[PDB]
Design a protein around this nucleic acid. Structure first.
Ligand SMILES: [Mg+2]
Ligand SMILES: [Mg+2]
Ligand SMILES: [Mg+2]
Ligand SMILES: [Mg+2]
Ligand SMILES: [Mg+2]
Ligand SMILES: [Mg+2]
Ligand SMILES: [Mg+2]
Ligand SMILES: [Mg+2]
Ligand SMILES: [Mg+2]
Ligand SMILES: [Mg+2]
Ligand SMILES: [Mg+2]
Ligand SMILES: [Mg+2]
Ligand SMILES: [Mg+2]
Ligand SMILES: [Mg+2]
Ligand SMILES: [Mg+2]
Ligand SMILES: [Mg+2]
Ligand SMILES: [Mg+2]
Ligand SMILES: [Mg+2]
Ligand SMILES: [Mg+2]
Ligand SMILES: [Mg+2]
Ligand SMILES: [Mg+2]
Ligand SMILES: [Mg+2]
Ligand SMILES: [Mg+2]
Ligand SMILES: [Mg+2]
Ligand SMILES: [Mg+2]
Ligand SMILES: [Mg+2]
Ligand SMILES: [Mg+2]
Ligand SMILES: [Mg+2]
Ligand SMILES: [Mg+2]
Ligand SMILES: [Mg+2]
Ligand SMILES: [Mg+2]
Ligand SMILES: [Mg+2]
Ligand SMILES: [Mg+2]
Ligand SMILES: [Mg+2]
Ligand SMILES: [Mg+2]
Ligand SMILES: [Mg+2]
Ligand SMILES: [Mg+2]
Ligand SMILES: [Mg+2]
Ligand SMILES: [Mg+2]
Ligand SMILES: [Mg+2]
Ligand SMILES: [Mg+2]
Ligand SMILES: [Mg+2]
Ligand SMILES: [Mg+2]
Ligand SMILES: [Mg+2]
Ligand SMILES: [Mg+2]
Ligand SMILES: [Mg+2]
Ligand SMILES: [Mg+2]
Ligand SMILES: [Mg+2]
Ligand SMILES: [Mg+2]
Ligand SMILES: [Mg+2]
Ligand SMILES: [Mg+2]
Ligand SMILES: [Mg+2]
Ligand SMILES: [Mg+2]
Ligand SMILES: [Mg+2]
Ligand SMILES: [Mg+2]
Ligand SMILES: [Mg+2]
Ligand SMILES: [Mg+2]
Ligand SMILES: [Mg+2]
Ligand SMILES: [Mg+2]
Ligand SMILES: [Mg+2]
Ligand SMILES: [Mg+2]
Ligand SMILES: [Mg+2]
Ligand SMILES: [Mg+2]
Ligand SMILES: [Mg+2]
Ligand SMILES: [Mg+2]
Ligand SMILES: [Mg+2]
Length: 183
RNA sequence: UAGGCAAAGCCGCCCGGUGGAUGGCUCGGCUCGGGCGCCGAAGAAGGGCGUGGCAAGCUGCGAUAAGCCCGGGGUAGCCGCAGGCAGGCUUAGAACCCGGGAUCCCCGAAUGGGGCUUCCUGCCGGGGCCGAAUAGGCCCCGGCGCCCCGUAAGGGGCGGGAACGCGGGGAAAGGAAACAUCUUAGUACCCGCAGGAAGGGAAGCCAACAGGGACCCCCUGAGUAGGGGCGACCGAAAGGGGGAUA
RNA sequence: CCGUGAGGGAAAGCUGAAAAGAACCCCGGAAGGGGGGUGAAAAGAGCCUGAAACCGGGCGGCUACAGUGGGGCAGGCCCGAAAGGAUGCCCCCUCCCGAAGGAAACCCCGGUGACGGGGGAGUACGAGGGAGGGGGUCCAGGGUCUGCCCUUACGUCUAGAAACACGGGCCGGGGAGUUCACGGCCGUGGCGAGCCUAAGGGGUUCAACCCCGGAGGCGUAGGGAAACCGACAGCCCGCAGCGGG
RNA sequence: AGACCAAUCAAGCCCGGUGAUAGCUGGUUCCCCCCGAAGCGGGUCUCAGCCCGGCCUCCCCGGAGGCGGCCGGCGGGGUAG
RNA sequence: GCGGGGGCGGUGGGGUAAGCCUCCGCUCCGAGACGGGAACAACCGAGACCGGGGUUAAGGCCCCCAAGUGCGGGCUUAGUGU
RNA sequence: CGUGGGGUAGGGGGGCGCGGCCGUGGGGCAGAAGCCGGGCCGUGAGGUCCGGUGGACCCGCGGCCGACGAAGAUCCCGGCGGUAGUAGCAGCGAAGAGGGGUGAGAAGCCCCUCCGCCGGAAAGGACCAGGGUUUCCUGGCAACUUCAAUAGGCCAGGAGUUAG
RNA sequence: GGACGGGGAACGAGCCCCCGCGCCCGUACCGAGAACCGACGCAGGUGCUCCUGGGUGAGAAGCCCAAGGCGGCUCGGGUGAC
RNA sequence: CGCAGGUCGCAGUGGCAAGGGGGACCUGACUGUUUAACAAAAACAUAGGUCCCCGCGAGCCCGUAAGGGUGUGUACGGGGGC
RNA sequence: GCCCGGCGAACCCACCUCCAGGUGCACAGUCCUGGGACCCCCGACGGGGCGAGAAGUCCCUAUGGAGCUUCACAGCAGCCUG
RNA sequence: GACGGGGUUGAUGGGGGGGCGGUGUAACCCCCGAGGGUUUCCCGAGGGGAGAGCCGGCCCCUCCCAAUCGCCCGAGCGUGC
C-alpha cells in the first residue's frame, strides 16, 4: 500500500517561509517514511515532537546518545505515572530513554539523508520541518487470564513520516534549542 | 497595567493514519405458478480413502481414477473453480453438449465369518509362486446371510428418498384468567407399510310417499343441528353448484 | 470449528477498459523508503467509493489569581471566494408622522415631613413607520475567548427525579402495532326491494384482462319453548321548509 | 451428605412440543395544529388485574331552553350554640 | 384512568404525636411557564403564541440587588432582634 | 366575529422523510448516487443551492403500496477509546560469568573455561494410553514463544519407521 | 505331556547329517513444570506406571557427590525509601 | 559389642534429620466412611444384641410380557426393621 | 517495591467532583448562602464518590414453580376377595 | 525528582602509609603429649612460647589514578493609564 504525508510540498514551503522567513522550492524538500514499525507509539510521538526543528546531524547525534543511554527524550503528553529525572534541557522533568524507537528513527533519518543527497541537497543545511507518528494497524494476539477468559495482547504498529528542507546556512540554527517551555 | 510570550490542557476547521459505514453493483436468497416424479442384491443412497507434472480445498472421477470407447450436434481451439510455470492434445476433427457403453478401491441393506478401529480372517473348487518335491507353505479368482415361494430349475423381501399417503402406539406445556371432566389433540413424537400419488369407490345408501342414484376433491349447507364443569370451547350430515366420469 | 455423544456451527463479495501488475536509479539486513514510470483516474494488488468514533500534525481562539456545560446581550482575535446583501451596514444631522405611556426647571396652594395638587403640559419625549444629507467599509454568517444577565444531564416507574432510584464508555449499522378470519363502527363509491357471486367454465396479447357461472349468502315480517299463528295513513304536537299578514 | 451419574442433580444432557404462559419488569423510532382527563362509586379467589357507571375526545340526530351566582315568594332540615 | 398529592376549613373520627391512618369541601401540583419566598411541585402574586414599548401584583427600597442610609412619635442595651 | 392562544394520558385534523409500483416531465462522462464543509428557504419534519471528493446513475410533480423514520431495551453485531505505556511478565528452595566464532545486528545462538542444580529424581533409564510427524536434514524469521533471537515442538523444502 | 486300548502297513524314528517354507498389521517421536487432558508452551490431573551408584545414616528419610542430564519451572539491569 | 587412658568447645543425635508433657469433664467403643468446589463431626458404618416374613411351587424384589434376581442357594439360611 | 530497557492487558467509564452550613424523592459534584484555591507531575493510602463486582438468597406479592409429607382433593399401579 | 559538598588557585571518591577498632593468637619454628610402633628421632587428639593473622560501608597524611572532555537556559523590545 501507499501511505500519504500529512503535509504536501507547497504547504511545506509555506511552513518553511512562515517559520524561518526564507522562500524555498519543492526541490529543496526531502521526505522519508517508515510504515508499520514495531515499537511504542506514544514514545514515537514524543520523539517526533522532540526532533522536529533540529538539523539532521543534530537529530542523529541526539538519537545516538539516546541509544547509548546518555541523553533522554522528553515525555510531554503520555506522562501519567512517569518518573521525574534530571534533564539536559530546561522546563520539563519527565524524561525517558526509548532505545528501540531511537534505532528505528535512526534508520528513518538515514533514509531521509540519502534522499536529500540523491536530490543533491546539502545535508549540513537540512532542517527537520515536519515529523509525525501515527498508530498503524494492529497485529492482534490474546493473553489467557484466570477463570477461562482471554484478553487482548496487541502489537500496535507505527507509521513515521518525516519531511526536511534545505535552508540557507545564515538561517539554519547552530546549536540545540532546549527551552521546552518556549519550544 | 497590558502585548512580545510560550507549560500541561480545552474547543473548532484542514490534512494524514486507523476503520469499514454510505452509495452504486449482483452468477445469491425468498415467495408464488407450472411440470415431473421413485432409486436398490445387475449391490443403491451415504461415508472413508485415493486420484492432477508442479495440486492444499472445492468440483469431477475410481488403480483405465478433472478421466476411456461409440454415435449425433459443434468447428478451431482445448488441458474445471483458477488470470501461474511447463509440457502436451487437436483439422486423421479435439474441447464442449446430448444419447448409449466401459471402468467403477474399502465400508455401507452388506449378504462366508468377525469387526475396540472402513480392517482382519475361514472352508471348498480352480490357478500361480517358493521349494528337490506331488510334501509343506504362501498368494489370486469364484462360491458360501436370514426368512420364504417352487417338484426342480429358479425366484422374492431386506436399504434409501425433501415433502406428501396408509395402519397402529401416543403426551404435556398452554387455555379454561386457580383446577381435575374438558381442551390442547388423535396433535408433537414413536413403531410399521406403499405409490408416483396414496387412501376412497359401485347401495343390507339417502330420502319421505316427491324423488335422487359409486367414489374422491373444491365452493356452500355452517359455526346450522348437535357435543360440552351446556363453561371454555368443540362440531357434522343430507341437499345444492363444480372438477371428473366407469 | 465446538461437544464423549445425541447434537451444534461461524466469519468471509467488488484493481483496472486493458496488467498497461509499477521498468530503471539511490538507500535499507529486510518489510520497505525517495526519485522515476503506467494509467482518464493509483484505482497498487492490504486494490470502487472510503463516513464516525479514535489517534497524529498544521492552523485559529484560550492557556498557570480563578470553578467548567447551554442561552441572550456587548466586546477581543480569526475566517467571511461561491452559494446571501453590498440598492447593505454603521455613525452623525435634519425633517415628518407616531400607539399605550409621559416628564423637568420655574411660578402658585397645602403638609413637621417624606410629598400631594393648579400651570408649565398630553408639552419635551415615546415602539415603530417615511424622506433626505454627509462620512466609512464591508454587513450577514461562522470558530474561539472574555464581561453582564439567565439556567438543578438524559430515558424511566412514580404523588413526587438533578437525585445517595435504575440503564447507557463512544461511534456506525440493525432494532418493536404485522397478517388472516370473524364482529361492531366510521369515510367514501356502485347498484337498490333488491345486492353480490363462490368453486368453476370459455376466450385472451395468458396468474392481468373480457365474458359466463345466482349454488348460496344477506335484506324484503314478526311473535312463540313448541305446536301454531302472522301485521298501519286514523289523530295530535311540531323543527326545517313553503305560503299569508 | 438428598451426595454422585462428563465444570450440569430436592430429579442429567440433546433435540422437539415451543415464538409454552406471564394481571409482572424492560424497550416501543418524524413534525405541526384543536380539545383535553383520572386515581371516585359498585361488582369481581377481588386488592400490582378486569367490567359497569362518573371524568375526556370525535361524529351524528334533535330542537329551545339551561344553571358552579343573586334577590324574592312558598317549603324541608335539627348541626354550632 | 380505576396507586394520587399539597394548602386551608369541619376541636372533622382515631392517635402521645407523626412529613401518621381514615372521611367531607374549595383550590392548586400531577398535566402549568413566570415574579416573590436565600434553594423548594402544589405558601403569596399570577396564568405564558412570537418580538418590542409601558404600567402594575406579591414583595421589597444600607450593600450583595432595581428601588429610600425615606418621614413623625415611642420602646430595647439583650447584637435581643433583624 | 371571538373577556381566542398553558397542557401529560388520550381522542381528532394536517404535513415531512425512506424503499418500490402506475403515470407524467426531466437531469447525467461538459460528471449521477454517496461523502466533507458552507449559504439560503421553511415554526418544523425537511428542502435547495455553492466549493471539494467521487465515478453511473438519479430526480420534480399526481396516484398507489410498504420488510418505512431510534438516543436509550445490564439492546444485537463491528470498530475504537480513557484507564495506560499502567497491572503483570516475583513467590512453588538452580544462576549465571569470561573469552572466542557466526551474523546487518548477540547478555541470551555455537565452542572452550569457571560457577551452580538434580542424582530411589518437578530433573537420570524404559514405556502404556493419548497425541500424530511434533522425529531427522537444509534454509529462514512476515506471524508464534509473557522480553531477545542469527534459536526453536514455529515457517518453507526434502527425508525417515525393514521381524518366522 | 504321558499312559491305557483298538486298527493298519513293511517299513523306520523323539537319535546324527542335510534340504525347504514361515503370510498380515504395529515399529519415527513425546511419553510430559512445552509433544496427553485441562480454551494456553497452564505450579493442576494423567504416570512416579516400572528401574536406578558412593558417603553419612535405622532408612527407597534428609544433606553432599557420581553415571547421566540441566541453567528453558523461558524478562534483564540499577536502588538498597516506606 | 565392651574397657582404660588423654583431650577441645558456649554448644558433641553440634549441620541434616528429629515426640512438649500432665490432670479432668462431655461425646462416639475402637479401625473405617462422608457433603469433588465453605461443614470431617458427636453424622454414617461397624462387630455385638434383638424382633419380623419365610420349608423353597416359600418370603422379598424386578419385568408390559417372555421371564428374571436372592439362587451353582435351603433356617448355623434369604429377605426386612430397630 | 521504586528507577531504567523490552513486551504490554483488564476492571470501571452519562459528563466527571476543593471545603462548610442548609434545602431537596427527607444522606448534593451540579441547587442556595458562605469559606478557599497559582497551575501541572510523582509516590502512598484507603475517608468519600450511598466506590466496583452480582436484575437482594433476607421480607412480601404472583389466583408462579419444584421436591418432600399426610388425617388435603382426586386418580393409577400392586396385593387381597367374589 | 530534589537538597548538600568538591570539581586541579583540588584532598571529592579510589590506591599507598599511619591512627583507632573487631575477632582471637595464622604460617614457620621450638618444647610437652595419653599411649603405640618401623624399639628413642615414626604416629598421635591436643597444651605451651615468639609471632599474631585477617579485616574495617571510620579518622589523618600523601596528587599515585579519576573529578575531564563537552551540552545547554538566560533579561535586552514596544503600549496605555
Ligand atoms: Mg481452564
Ligand atoms: Mg507495542
Ligand atoms: Mg501548550
Ligand atoms: Mg457413493
Ligand atoms: Mg461382512
Ligand atoms: Mg421399503
Ligand atoms: Mg401454543
Ligand atoms: Mg388454567
Ligand atoms: Mg398453573
Ligand atoms: Mg389414485
Ligand atoms: Mg388405490
Ligand atoms: Mg376434534
Ligand atoms: Mg479504497
Ligand atoms: Mg462572500
Ligand atoms: Mg449575491
Ligand atoms: Mg421508581
Ligand atoms: Mg415511592
Ligand atoms: Mg403519573
Ligand atoms: Mg428524570
Ligand atoms: Mg428495576
Ligand atoms: Mg451504567
Ligand atoms: Mg437435609
Ligand atoms: Mg428427572
Ligand atoms: Mg428445551
Ligand atoms: Mg384548554
Ligand atoms: Mg409497577
Ligand atoms: Mg332562595
Ligand atoms: Mg354542643
Ligand atoms: Mg385506590
Ligand atoms: Mg386533598
Ligand atoms: Mg424563589
Ligand atoms: Mg441599587
Ligand atoms: Mg393549548
Ligand atoms: Mg410520489
Ligand atoms: Mg425512547
Ligand atoms: Mg460491544
Ligand atoms: Mg485501551
Ligand atoms: Mg517499564
Ligand atoms: Mg510491577
Ligand atoms: Mg538442594
Ligand atoms: Mg547438589
Ligand atoms: Mg523420567
Ligand atoms: Mg526438531
Ligand atoms: Mg533445524
Ligand atoms: Mg510444521
Ligand atoms: Mg523407537
Ligand atoms: Mg510454561
Ligand atoms: Mg534419598
Ligand atoms: Mg556427570
Ligand atoms: Mg533464566
Ligand atoms: Mg526485576
Ligand atoms: Mg530442619
Ligand atoms: Mg468414631
Ligand atoms: Mg479414625
Ligand atoms: Mg465441601
Ligand atoms: Mg473442610
Ligand atoms: Mg451412629
Ligand atoms: Mg451392647
Ligand atoms: Mg422400637
Ligand atoms: Mg428537608
Ligand atoms: Mg455524585
Ligand atoms: Mg430483584
Ligand atoms: Mg434473583
Ligand atoms: Mg426464605
Ligand atoms: Mg390476585
Ligand atoms: Mg420434577
Amino acid at each position: 500500500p501507499h501511505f500519504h504525508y500529512s503535509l504536501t510540498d507547497e504547504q511545506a514551503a509555506e511552513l518553511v517561509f512562515k517559520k524561518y522567513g526564507v522562500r524555498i522550492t519543492p526541490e529543496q524538500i526531502a521526505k522519508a517514511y517508515a510504515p508499520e514499525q514495531r515499537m511504542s507509539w506514544k514514545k514515537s510521538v514524543e520523539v517526533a515532537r522532540f526532533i522536529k526543528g533540529m538539523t539532521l546531524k543534530q537529530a542523529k547525534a541526539w538519537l545516538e546518545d539516546v541509544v547509548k543511554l546518555k541523553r533522554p527524550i522528553p515525555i510531554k503528553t503520555f506522562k501519567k505515572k512517569q518518573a521525574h529525572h534530571a534533564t539536559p534541557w530546561e522546563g520539563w522533568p519527565v524524561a525517558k530513554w526509548p532505545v528501540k524507537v531511537a534505532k528505528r528513527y535512526l534508520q528513518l533519518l538515514e533514509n531521509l539523508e540519502n534522499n536529500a543527497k540523491f536530490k543533491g541537497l546539502d545535508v549540513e543545511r537540512l532542517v527537520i520541518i515536519h515529523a509525525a507518528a501515527h498508530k498503524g494497524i494492529k497485529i492482534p494476539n490474546i493473553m489467557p487470564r484466570a477463570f477461562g477468559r482471554a484478553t487482548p495482547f496487541n502489537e500496535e504498529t507505527v507509521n513515521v513520516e518525516i519531511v526536511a528542507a534545505e535552508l540557507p546556512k545564515e538561517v539554519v540554527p547552530k546549536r540545540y534549542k532546549l527551552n521546552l517551555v518556549k519550544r
